[PDB]
From a paper:
By searching sequence databases for members of the IL6 cytokine family, a new protein, designated interleukin (IL) 23p19 was identified. This new protein had no biological activity, but formed in combination with the p40 subunit of IL12 a novel heterodimeric cytokine named IL23. The identical p40 subunit of both cytokines binds to the receptor (R) IL12Rβ1, the p35 subunit of IL12 binds to the IL12Rβ2 subunit, and the p19 subunit of IL23 binds to the unique IL23R subunit. IL23 binds to and signals through the heterodimeric IL12Rβ1/IL23R complex, which is associated with Tyk2 and Jak2, respectively. IL23 is also produced by antigen-presenting cells and promotes the expansion and survival of a distinct lineage of T cells, Th17 (3).
To better understand the mode of action of those neutralizing nanobodies, the crystal structure of hIL23 in complex with the nanobodies 37D5 (p19+), 22E11 (p40+), and 124C4 (p19−) was generated. The crystals contain two complexes in the asymmetric unit and the structure was refined to R/Rfree values of 18.3%/21.8%, respectively. Totally unexpected from the interaction studies in solution, the structure reveals that the p19+ 37D5 nanobody and the p19− [name] interact with both subunits of hIL23, p19 and p40. As frequently observed with nanobodies, [name] and [name] bind to concave surfaces and insert their complementarity-determining regions (CDRs) in the crevices formed at the junction between p19 and p40. In contrast and as expected, the p40+ 22E11 nanobody interacts only with p40 and binds a flat surface of the cytokine’s first p40 domain, remote from the two other nanobodies that bind the third p40 domain. The three nanobodies interact with hIL23 with high affinity, which correlates with very large buried surface areas: ~1,110 Å2 for [name], ~830 Å2 for [name], and ~780 Å2 for [name]. [name] was initially assigned as a p19 binder and has, indeed, a larger surface of interaction with p19 (850 Å2) than with p40 (260 Å2). The 124C4 nanobody, which was initially assigned as a p19 binder, exhibits a binding pattern opposite to the one of 37D5, with a larger surface of interaction with p40 (625 Å2) than for p19 (200 Å2). Analysis of the X-ray structure of hIL23 in complex with [name] and [name] was used to predict the peptide linker lengths needed to combine these two nanobodies in a multivalent construct, enabling simultaneous binding of both nanobodies to hIL23.
Numbering used by the authors:
A (entry chain B): 1 to 139, 143 to 159, 162 to 257, 265 to 305
B (entry chain J): 3 to 108, 109A, 110 to 111, 114 to 126
C (entry chain A): 8 to 31, 47 to 118, 135 to 168
D (entry chain H): 1 to 123
E (entry chain G): 1 to 27, 27B, 28C, 28B, 28A, 28 to 121
Write the structure that this text describes.
Amino acid sequence: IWELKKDVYVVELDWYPDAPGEMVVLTCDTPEEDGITWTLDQSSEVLGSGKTLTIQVKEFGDAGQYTCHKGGEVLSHSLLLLHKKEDGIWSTDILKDQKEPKNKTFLRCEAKNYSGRFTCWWLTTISTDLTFSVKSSRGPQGVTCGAATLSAERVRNKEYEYSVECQEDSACPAAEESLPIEVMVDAVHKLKYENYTSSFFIRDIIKPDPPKNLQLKPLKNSRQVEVSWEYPDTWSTPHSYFSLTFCVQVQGDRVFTDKTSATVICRKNASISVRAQDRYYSSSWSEWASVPC
Amino acid sequence: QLVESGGGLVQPGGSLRLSCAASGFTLDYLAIGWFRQAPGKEREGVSCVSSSGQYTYYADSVKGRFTISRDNAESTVYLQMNSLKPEDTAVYYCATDPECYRVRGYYNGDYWGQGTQVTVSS
Amino acid sequence: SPAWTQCQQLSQKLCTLAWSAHPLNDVPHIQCGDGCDPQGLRDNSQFCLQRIHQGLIFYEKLLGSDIFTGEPSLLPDSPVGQLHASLLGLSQLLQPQPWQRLLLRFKILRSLQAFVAVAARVFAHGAATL
Amino acid sequence: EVQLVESGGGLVQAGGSLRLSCAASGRTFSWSAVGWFRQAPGKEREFVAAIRWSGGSPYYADSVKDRFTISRDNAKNTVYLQMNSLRPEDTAVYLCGETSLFPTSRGSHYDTWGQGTQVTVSS
Amino acid sequence: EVQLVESGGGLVQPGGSLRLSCAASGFTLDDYAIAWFRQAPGKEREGVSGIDSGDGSAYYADSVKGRFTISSDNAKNTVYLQMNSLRPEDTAVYYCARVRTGWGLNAPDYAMDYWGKGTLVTVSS
Ligand SMILES: *C1O[C@H](CO)[C@@H](O[C@@H]2O[C@H](CO)[C@@H](O[C@@H]3O[C@H](CO[C@H]4O[C@H](CO)[C@@H](O)[C@H](O)[C@@H]4O)[C@@H](O)[C@H](O[C@H]4O[C@H](CO)[C@@H](O)[C@H](O)[C@@H]4O)[C@@H]3O)[C@H](O)[C@H]2NC(C)=O)[C@H](O)[C@H]1NC(C)=O
C-alpha cells in the first residue's frame, strides 16, 4: 500500500485465479484510540473495532471507501484503489493506445515553440466516474500543469480526448536541455487506478504552426510564380535566432529553402503547399499551408 | 518515415524489386538496411547500404541473388531480389541502419513500420 | 571580431552531419548563465563563444577516442569523419571495453545534436545583426 | 445501454447437467466482464463466476470451482454457465451481471443485470 | 536604461483613425519582438498585435484583425500601430511591451519583460 493523495491509497494487486492478495493494515487518522469502528462504502456492517483494521485485498470487492467512526461521528475516510497487474503487466484500460508514433503510446505531447510551454493529450472511451491528475517536472519542480479538460468527442467507437497545458517555471529557451521533462498522469475509473508517463526534451516535441500569409506573385513567364509566406505567429522570437526551414510542394515539384520565398511552375487547377521545420534540429514538420494557382 | 513497397506473391526462381521511400526527408548521407520477418520467427538482417553506396553488406543466405542500391535524389533504397525461394518468404522492413551495425552483426537500440509481404509459393 | 557568416555556415553543416550520423554520462552544455541569448550576444559575445569553443574541443576529443575508433568499426565513408573535421574547423574559427560501446556513441551523438543546434542559432543571430 | 437476457433454466434430475446462457446486446467497455450470481431460498445472493469478453482467466467462487464452467462466444455475444453433477442445493434463481471492475464478487460492482433464470434440481 | 515610451493617445470619433508610436531604449529592436497590449477600463490586460522587428512579420488578435496595422522603423528604434475604423469597444490604455526571448508574437502578458506607462485611446460614441 502507498498514499496517492490525502486519504487516498493504492494497493498493487498481482491477480491470478487463486488469491492470495495483500494483507493491508489501515490506521484511523485521529488522536482518538478507543471506541473506533470501521465500515466499507455503503454497508452498515462493522468490519472491525480499533484504531487499526487488517484487510486481505484479493479483488475489487476489497477496494472502496473504508470509514472510521466514534460516538456517532465519522473520524476519517480511507479510499482504497487497486493497481491491478496480471501476467506481470499493469492494466491500461482507461487510456486508449494512440498507435502512433509506435505502439503503447497513451500520452502525446507537443510544443509550438521553445517558451517552456507545452500540451499533452490522451484518449478514453469512459464518460463517468473518471478523474485525471497531471504532474510534471524537469529531472525539480519547474513545471506547472493546468487541469485535464475534455477537448474533443469523436464518434463511430465513441472516444473522448483530454488535454492539459503545462509550463516550465524557469525555462531558458536559448540553453541546451540536459535533463528531460517527465509528464505523469494518474487515471482513476471507479476503484481502478492506472498510471501513464512520458519522458521527452522540448526540442523533440517541437511542431511549429504552419507558414502564414501564403501569396503568389505572377512572373514574366506564363505558369511561373513567386511564392512567399511568413513565419507562424506562435513561433519563437527573435526569428533570426530561432530560424525555420521550409518545404514547398506543387500538388496535383518540390523545393527546400531557408528563405520565405520560392519560384515554382504552376499548372492552373493545382495547389502550392508550404510546411516549416526547425532549421537546426530534426523535429516535426508543421501542417501544410496551401494556396491555389 | 520510410515507406516499404514492391512486395508480392512470386514463383520459386522469380524476381521482385522492393523500394523504401523516405518522406519527409532526403536519403542523402544515410546508411539504410533491409530486414525480414518470417511467420512466428525473429527479425533478420538482409542487406545494408552505406551513406555513399560504396559499402554493401549481405546476410550469407542472400548473397548472389539479392542486390541493394541507392537512388539519385529519388530518396529511395532498392532491394533487387533475384532467384527467389520459399525460404525468402517474410514481411520485409527497411530502416536506418547507421554504420550498418545491424546487418553487419551487432545490436541496436529498432522499428517502425509496416513492411511489404513477400511470398514465394513452394 | 568573429567570422559570423563563416561560423553560421559551418555550424549549420554540423547540424546536418550530427543528424546524418544518427537519425532519431558526461558532457558540457550551454547553460542559462552562458549568455547565448540575443541580449548576452549584444553585451559581450565572448562569454557564449568561449563556452561554444570549450564544448567543440570536448566533442572532437571524444569523437577521436576509442569510443569511436574501437569496435564495431565505423564505416570508412561515415559522416562522423566529416563531423570530427568540421568541429575542428569551427573551433579554429573561434580561436585559431568490447561490444556494443555503441550505446555510448549514441549517447554522445544525441547530446552533440543538441549542442550544435544552440551554436547554429547563436551564429545565425550574430551573422544577421552583429 | 446494454441488456442482458438469461435462459436455459428449468427442472433437472439431481446429478444431471444444464448449460445456462446469457445473451448481451453489447458491452459497455472492451474490458467489461459478465458475472453469474445465484439466489437460493433463505440464503443471500452469491457470486458464482465471471469472465471478460476480451478473454483471459475467469474468476470463480471457491464453492463451485470446477464443477461449474464459465465460457463465452464473442460471435454470438453470449456467456455460458455449464453446470455438471447438479445437487438440490444448486436450486436457485441464476442471475447475469455486467462489470468494468474484473475481478469482483461484489454485486454493487455490477452495473446492469438480467431478469434471471430458475434452476430447480429435483432429487 | 530599458524604456518603452508610448505616444499618440487621444479622443476619437467612432469610425475614426489614429496612429500610436512606441519609442524603444536602451536595447536594440532586432534582438526582440515588440507586442502591443490594451487595457479597457475595469478589464484585464489583453494582447493586440506583435511584431518581429527583424522580419516585419506581424500578428493581430481576432478583435483587431483587418483594422490595425503594426510596423517598425529599426533606424528610429520605434514601433507604430495604425488603428483604423475605431469603435467604442476599442477604448483602452494601450501598452507597448518587450517579448521575452523564445516566446511568440501572441505571447501572454506574463511573457513580457518590460512595459510602457501606456497611452489612452478613448472612442466616444
Ligand atoms: C505509479 O504506479 C507504480 C505502481 O503502483 C508506483 O510505484 C510504487 O510507488 C510507491 C510510492 O512511491 C512505492 O511505495 C514505496 O514502497 C517502498 C517499498 O518497501 C516495502 O516493500 C518491500 C517489498 O516486499 C518490503 O520488503 C519492505 O520491507 C517494505 O515494506 C516503501 O518503503 C515506501 O515507504 C514510504 O511510503 C509509505 C506509504 O506512503 C510509508 O509507509 C513509509 O513511511 C515511506 O515514507 C513506499 O511505500 C511502491 O513500492 C512502488 N511500486 C512499484 C511497483 O514500483 C508509482 O509510484 C506510481 N507513480 C506515480 C507517478 O504516482
